[PDB]
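new request in #modeling-help
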Amino acid sequence: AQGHRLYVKAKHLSFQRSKHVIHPGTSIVKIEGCDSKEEAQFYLGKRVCYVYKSSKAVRGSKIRVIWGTIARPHGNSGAVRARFVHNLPAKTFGSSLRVMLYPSNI
Amino acid sequence: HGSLGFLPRKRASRQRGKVKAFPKDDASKPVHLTAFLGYKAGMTHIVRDLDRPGSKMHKREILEAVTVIETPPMVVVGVVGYVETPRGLRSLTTVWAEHLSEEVKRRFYKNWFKSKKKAFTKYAKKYAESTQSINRELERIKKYCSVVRVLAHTQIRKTPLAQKKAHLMEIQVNGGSVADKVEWAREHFEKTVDIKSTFEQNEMIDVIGVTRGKGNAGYMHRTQLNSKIYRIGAGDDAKNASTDFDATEKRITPMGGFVRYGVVENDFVMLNGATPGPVKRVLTLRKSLLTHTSRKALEPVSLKWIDTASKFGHGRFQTPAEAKQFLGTLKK
Amino acid sequence: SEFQKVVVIDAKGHLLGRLASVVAKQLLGGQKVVVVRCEELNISGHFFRNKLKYLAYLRKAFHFRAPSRIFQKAVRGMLPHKTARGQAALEHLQAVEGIPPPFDKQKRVVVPAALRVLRLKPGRKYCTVGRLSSEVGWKYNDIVAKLEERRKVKSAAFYQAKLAKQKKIASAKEASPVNQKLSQFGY
RNA sequence: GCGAAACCACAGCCUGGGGAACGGGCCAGGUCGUCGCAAUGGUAAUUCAACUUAGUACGAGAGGAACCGUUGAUUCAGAUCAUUGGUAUUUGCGCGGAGCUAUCAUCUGCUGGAUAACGGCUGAACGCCUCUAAGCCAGAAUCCGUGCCAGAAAGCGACGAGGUCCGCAUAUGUAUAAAAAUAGAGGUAGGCUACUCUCCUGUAUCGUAGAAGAUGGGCGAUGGUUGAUGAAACGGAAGUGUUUUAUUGACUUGUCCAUGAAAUUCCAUGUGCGGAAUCGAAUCCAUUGCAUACGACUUUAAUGUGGAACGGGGUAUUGAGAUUCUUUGUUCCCAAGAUUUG
RNA sequence: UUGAGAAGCUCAGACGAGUAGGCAGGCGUGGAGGUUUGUGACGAAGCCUUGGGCGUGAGCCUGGGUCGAACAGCCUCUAGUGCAGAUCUUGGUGGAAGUAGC
RNA sequence: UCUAGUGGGCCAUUUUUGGUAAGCAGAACUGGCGAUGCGGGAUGAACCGAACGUGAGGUUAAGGUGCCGGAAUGUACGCUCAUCAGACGAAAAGGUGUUAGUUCA
C-alpha cells in the first residue's frame, strides 16, 4: 500500500502562547523530518490539513477536513506556525496533520 | 491494643488458618508436605516427666496443659504451579486430580443441592478423555515452575462434624526438584496422607489458626510458635491415651466425648499449650519457619499419663471402665 | 525526527531526569512510549546521596519502590497531571522492569540526549536505580537479575541465527553481477 | 399519623507560600464460586532477676570473668474458655448442666544482613608510613529486610460451573528483537588463542510499477510473495506470538509486448438497544446465630445413609428421683418457592 | 457629478487610563397638544421562546407560540418617570426537613 | 474676572542627625501608589519592563528557551561534586578539600 501519501506527516503541538495567554488563531505544527528553521523554509505556504471522522454520514461520507496553510517557522527546531480556516480544537494537541507538497515551487 | 503488630484488629475472613509464609525448601530436603490441617479436639492437661539438663524438675514428672488436635489424614487431589515473576508469584496452571469427593466438590457449591452438582464433572471427563492434556499441564509445571503446592481436602466424614464441605488447603510440597514434587503429587493424586507422615511429633510445629469470635473482639488469624508435638496418636490406636506408665488401654477420647466436638475417631496430634480458635476448629499444623534448636525442642517427650476425665460435664475418673469395679454394683 | 505508534526504549545507561524529560515531551506530543529495563536507569550522584533523598521521601503519600514506579513518578512530575491532557498523556507510558515477552521481540531504541556515557563526565560516581531500589524495599532484584540471562541467551541465539541467515544473502549479493554493474548510484 | 423554628452570598480533602486575614476562594504540590500471589502500610515483647554456670579463669588475694541452663518475675499484646473458679430461666435439680467469661484453667510474643561511633586489613596522597583518600571487614540497644497482623470495597493469577427468537436503530509502509563498554567492544582464521576486519549511528536495511494498481499473449526462473484450510514444533515474564510447513489457488513487476484508462477536460474528500420463550448460578427464602441499631455477615431446607421436630436415650447435672449432644424409632419436611443478574 | 436635512456634504492630521468633580449627546416609562388621510377580531396590549436581525450601549425591530380589545411612531409639553442592595415595605416560595418533636 | 472638588497617608529611595549592646529613631529630599489595567517576578499592593479605543500583521522590553511552558538538551572558555551542593548568626574558624595565580624563593 506504499503507493500513496503524497503528503508529509505532522503533529499539532499547541497554539501560539505566552506563559499564561493562548492565541488559538495560530497553531504550532511540528513537521516530521524538518529539524531546523532553515528546512522549515521549504514548507512555508504549503497546505496543511487536519483529517478527522465524525458520527454523522453527512455528504454521504464519514470524514471531514479542516484546511490551513503554513505561515512562518517557529523557534529553532523546525516547528512552524499554521493558520487554519477554522481554529484547530484544543483537543487536537498531539494529533496528526498532513502537509501536502502544493503550492509547489519545486 | 498497645502492640500495633496486631493493631488494627479486624476479624479474619477465612476460618481455616492461612499459611502466609511456607517454610523454605531446597533440593537436599526430601520431598515432603509442610502443613497438615487439624481439628481442635480438646486441650486437657496430662502428666509427663521432664528430662532436661539443668531443669529444676530434671527427671521429674510434670502435669502439662497439652492439646489434642483431631487430624484426619489429608487427601491431595490436585496441584498448582507457581512461576516466579518480577511482579510476584503467579499461578501458572492448576492440575486437579481426576476424581473428587462430593465433600470437596461441595465446597465450591454454596448449596450443593442446586441442580446438577457439576463440580469438575466435565473436568473429570476431559481428564480421562485427554490424559495427554494433564501430561502437558504436568510438563508445563515441571518446565515453568519453582513452587509446587498440592490441593488437599479435609476428611470431615471421619470427624464428628456436621459440616460436609471439605476444607481445601493448598499445602506446599517442599524439597527435591520441581519435577520430583510434581511426581510425588501425581502418584499421590486422589490419595490420603496421615499427619504422622507429615510430622514426626518430635518436630516443633508452629500451629496457626484463626482466633474465635468473642461475639472487633476476636476472630483473627494467629500463628502460634514453639509448639513441639507430644504424641501423634492415630485414630485406630486405642492405646493412644495409654502411655507406658498408664499401660491400661484408653482411647484419646475421654468419658463424655469431647466438649462440643464429640469423640475422636481419627488420628490426632498431642501438643502442649493452647491455640487460637474454638473447639473442633480447622487448625493449620505446619512446619516451623525457623529451625529453632531450643532445649525444649531438643528434649524428647515421655508422656506420663493421659488425662481422660470427663469432657462436657464433670468426671472424677480416667475412664468409666476402671470406675465400674471401683464403685459398688449399681442398682441396674 | 519521525514518530512511531509505539516506541520501546531500552533504559540501560539512561539518566533518570534526561530520559524522563524526553519521554514526557514525547507523551505530550501524541505518542505511546514503552520504557523497558527501568531497573538499569542511572542517577548522577553517589549511593548515599540519593539514598538520603529517598529516605527523606519515605519520611513524607504512597511510597513506591519499584524502579518503574520511580521512573513513572519522575515522568509524571513533568506533565500537566492536573488537567485531562496531562492524564491522557500519562496513560500512554508503560514503564516496566526487564523486557517482558511482548517487548523482547521488538526493536528497542535509545535516547542519546539521556545516555550516561554522553552526558556524565568520566570518573563521576553514579547510582543505578535498580540497585538503589533493592535496599529501600524492592525485593524482586535477584529474580529479575537472574531472568535477564535467560532473555539474553535466547536473544543472543536469535542474533546468531539471523546473522548466519544473513550471510547467505550477503554472499549472494556480490555473487550477482548486477550488484556492481549498476552500483554507480551509490547502492 | 400529625409536624415546626432559628439560620442561609456561595461552594467546601490536606501540606507550604501568597507580605494588607490571604483562605475556603490564589500559586506550587499531595455471572457465581475455588485456591493463591502482594502494590501498600503497621509491628513487640521490654526484658531482667536469682541460683548454679561462681567464688569460675584472671586475679597475692579480694573482686570477678567467660560461661551455662533452669526457675520465675516487672510491664504490655493477641488469645483459646479443654480442665477448673464463677456460672445461673437447664428455671434442670443451695448445686446448677450445654456453653460462656475469667491466666481465676492455659497458651502466649521472630531473626538474618547492612551499618553509627570505635576498632582493624589493604594502601596512596606524602617511595616508607598512614582504618581512607579508591576500597573492604569487624562492630550499636541503630537501620534495613525476615516473621506476625492486615490487604488494593475499582490489585491481580490459576481453576470449576449466558445462548435462542421478536421488534427497532444502523492509518495511509500501522516494516525493522544479541549483549556490551569507552581505562572500547563486536566478531575473526586456526586450534584456547593469534592477528586482521567493522564502527566513526538508521541519510541504513527490508519492501516500493500496474485504469489503488486492469485484461491478455507470454517469456526467463520453472520461484519469490501471499490468501485459504490441514497441521506440528518452539515461545511462561505478561509465552499469544516465532517458525516448520503439507498442499490448494493466485499476483508473479524477473523480463518483453499488445489492448483498456478520458467531458471528474486547473485544487476542494454484521453491530447496537428494548422485549419475551430457555438454561444455569446467586440472594431472599426453611433458615441459623456463627453475625447483631438496621444494614450486612456465617451455616444448613431440592426425593434423600436427606434436613428438621418429637417419642426419647446418652453425656453430665443432681445426690432415691428428674432434666437436657445423640438416635438403624416415629413423623414433619419433601423435584422448597420467589427475586436477581448471567 | 447631481455629494445644499449649510443643522448637509467633504478633506486632512493628531490623540484615546481615570476616583471626586465638570460638560455634552442619547435610550426608556405614565399622561397632554399636534401629527402619521397610523396599527387592530383576517387579532391591540401583555406574556413565553436553544427563531432572526439592528445599535459601542441604554435599547429597538421581527418570526413562532399563547392571548383576547385596545395601541403605537414622529414634533412638542408634562412628571408621583428607570433599582440588586436600605438588619427596606407588602406578597409569594425554598433549603433546613418530613428533621426537632407530639 | 469667577467656579466645582481636595486641606491625608502609605511604599519607601536618597542625602541626613541622634544614635544604641545592635537594630533603630528624627528631619529634609526624591518620586511612585494613591485616580492605573498590562508582560515578567513560581504565586505576590507597591521590584524589573511598560502606562490602555476595536482589530489584523510585524518587531521588541523586562524576563526567559530540559519538562511542566511559548522558545537552542545552542556554540566557546573556566570553577565545583556538596552523604544538608548550587540555582535564593551558629560565619569566627577548621579544612591529610581544592582550583588558579602573586611574593620571597
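bot summary: Chain C is about 50% helix and 10% strand.
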